């Protein structure tokens, strides 16, 4: 019981320090800011090739090719500009929760309930998509396997453990077992040296790829965290949870700095993303419509109300030219302003 | 425009392949098999394959030339409040419970309650398989274990007229069977609003007619779905 008492004392010290830092609120340093105003993003192009509920997508580095994963068991790579379907990869397991596009655009990763992340090569000399690699070893369902480079993939699984994998040898290069619940999604910082993840315990943790140890922990949420994304600079990240409230966390501050919630909003958040400045926190909701908020003033900026079912996956191009939303109605929609 | 024309041609081929996949996808039905450790869902899976940390196992079977995909959760943690949401468009959920064990029966009842009350499972009928009936009958005949202690409401229970006892079945065994079935049906009907129904069946681990019952339940579910879709219900 001594260890429990020591842990309680350390938690009290953590709380006291974090309080000692907190003098002012983001809302105050930002009260002197002009509101963004109503955002009137409209649907420019619509993709209807998918069969079942889409569950994951990832914009490419070129902001022209996108990858979408659908539970029919299909990974479709679309050309956003011309609506043409660049590729269609059938998947061995119909249940897919995550998909990622390599920075160079040569490899595409996917994963789901199979507890495996499968990587396919698009630049084969034959011109046909094939299973380049299969990574196994996780004892839980893969919720997000993202790319760092062509030969190294970081993944989050439902065994409360995250992994870094070398793809040539196919073994677990690094392992992270600090969480106590299902890790739901992770985001890589642009520096490609730290990454932040969230678990089904109202807890987010920061991890170092090279070292392999937990850096910081944040427990500001009430319910399970489903979405996480890194603010452009890499020093902050937004989190969405089933409690219907989003939050903003900063690594250096080590505590929450914003909360986005409303009385009318009762549904949780499935996917979150930031814009190229960080002034537009877009977030999916189970109410079948996405909402974009002013990240600095916590003022609702716009609502994308075109969707028939729960929005699952949200993506923003590298240049922030368009926002792509994929819901359970087997339709991806590209939204842009005027 | 040669590159553009090639791009549109490739898109057309991909569209044709996706249309083939569409026809295949609508030609098969998806079912989710769930149960506890005590429940003999593995035995059912073995006896229905007569037509590594994998995580999920898939059974392909066929009844009346209708293809059925069953998915069984494998190397996954006890937590189930999140991945279950992937099974929101399955045709049906086959829930297997061990009626012989009076202890842990309340756990199965609570699991059924959670499944029924789940937001994303409100539009999916649940097929109920009360398994291990022979063990329940033997336990009732022995009399060593009494349902009254676990379920004090069982004392006042009486077999309803709707009950159809099997030939050569002791009144006590059928009374207990239908008491447990009514316990399940109370939860089934408490939240049912016309978009959710249960199919109570008395089944055994060694049974060759479970597939027929599953096919009939799927037929009824799709019949109701068509009734609603074709402006009749």
């Amino acid at each position, epitope marked *: 019981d001594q260890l429990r008492q020591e842990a309680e004392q350390l938690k009290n010290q953590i709380r006291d320090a974090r309080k000692a830092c907190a003098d002012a609120t983001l809302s105050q340093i930002t009260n002197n800011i002009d509101p963004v105003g109503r955002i009137q993003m409209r649907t420019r192009r619509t993709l209807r090739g998918h069969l079942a509920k889409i569950y994951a997508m990832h914009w490419g580095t070129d902001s022209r090719l996108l990858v979408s994963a659908s539970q029919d068991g299909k990974l479709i790579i679309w050309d956003s500009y011309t609506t043409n379907k660049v590729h269609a990869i059938p998947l061995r397991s119909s249940w897919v929760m995550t998909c990622a596009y390599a920075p160079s655009g040569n490899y595409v990763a996917c994963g789901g309930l199979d507890n495996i992340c499968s990587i396919y090569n698009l630049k084969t000399r034959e011109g046909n998509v094939r299973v380049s690699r299969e990574l196994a070893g996780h004892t839980g369902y893969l919720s997000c396997c993202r790319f760092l480079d062509d030969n190294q993939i970081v993944t989050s699984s439902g065994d409360t453990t995250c992994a870094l994998w070398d793809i040539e040898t196919g073994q677990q290069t690094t392992t992270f077992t600090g969480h*106590t619940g299902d890790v739901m999604s992770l985001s890589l910082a642009p520096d490609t040296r730290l990454f932040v993840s969230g678990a089904c315990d109202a807890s987010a943790k920061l991890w170092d790829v090279r070292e392999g140890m937990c850096r910081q922990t944040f427990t500001g949420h009430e319910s399970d965290i489903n979405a996480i994304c890194f603010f452009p600079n890499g020093n902050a990240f937004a989190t969405g949870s089933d409690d219907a409230t989003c939050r903003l966390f900063d690594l250096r501050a080590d505590q929450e700095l914003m909360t986005y919630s409303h009385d009318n909003i009762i549904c949780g958040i499935t996917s979150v993303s930031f814009s190229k400045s960080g002034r537009l926190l877009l977030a999916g909701y189970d109410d079948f419509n996405c909402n974009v908020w002013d990240a600095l003033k916590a003022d609702r900026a716009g609502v994308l109300a075109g969707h028939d079912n729960r929005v699952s996956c949200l993506g923003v191009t590298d240049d922030g030219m368009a926002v792509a939303t994929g819901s359970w109605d087997s339709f991806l929609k590209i939204w842009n302003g005027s | 425009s040669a590159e553009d024309k090639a791009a549109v041609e490739r898109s057309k081929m991909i569209e044709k392949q996706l249309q083939k996949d569409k026809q295949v996808y609508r030609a098969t039905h998806r079912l989710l098999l769930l149960g506890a450790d005590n429940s003999g869902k593995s035995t059912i899976v073995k006896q229905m394959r007569i037509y590594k940390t994998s995580g999920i196992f898939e059974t392909k079977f066929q009844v009346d030339k209708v293809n059925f995909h069953m998915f069984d959760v494998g190397a996954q943690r006890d937590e189930r409040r999140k991945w279950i949401q992937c099974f929101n468009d399955v045709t049906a959920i086959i829930f297997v419970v061990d009626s012989s064990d009076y202890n842990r029966l309340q756990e199965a009842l609570n699991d059924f309650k959670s499944i*029924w009350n789940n937001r994303w499972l409100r539009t999916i009928s649940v097929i109920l398989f009360l398994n291990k009936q022979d063990l329940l009958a033997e336990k009732v005949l022995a009399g060593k274990s009494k349902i009254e202690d676990y379920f004090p409401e069982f004392a006042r229970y009486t077999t309803p007229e709707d009950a159809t006892p099997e030939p050569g079945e002791d009144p006590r065994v059928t009374r207990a069977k239908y008491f447990i079935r009514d316990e399940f049906l109370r939860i089934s009907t408490a939240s049912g609003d016309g978009r959710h129904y249960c199919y109570p069946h008395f089944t055994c681990s060694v049974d060759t007619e479970n597939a027929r019952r599953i096919f009939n339940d799927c037929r009824d579910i799709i019949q109701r779905m068509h009734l609603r879709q074709y402006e009749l219900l």
Partner: nanobody
Amino acid sequence: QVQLQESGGGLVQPGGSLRLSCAASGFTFSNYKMNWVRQAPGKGLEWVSDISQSGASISYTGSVKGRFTISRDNAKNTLYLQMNSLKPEDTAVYYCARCPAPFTRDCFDVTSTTYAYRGQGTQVTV
């Protein structure tokens, strides 16, 4: 942040009467349907009873029916469970648990081996 602390317990002779309290901090007590669990020596976690947000809907396991009762105090952020006619076979570590999500009628993993929204628990002995 989230913290559930249980209070009460101690040795009691068979047939006594006790009251166990459950204080919650971090979330909103009202929006969450809460339960009671118990782990008994040589046995696993068992679902005792539940109470909803409004408190007008209750359910008990028959083994503790007619004997124990559940109440909620949203203003005090506190759950209460009365123990009456206590039997020796009701000796266990009692845990306070809440349903994963708010405004939700389903609670799946309340009885799992590990649950990130359950308190330390208190040892009630008889």
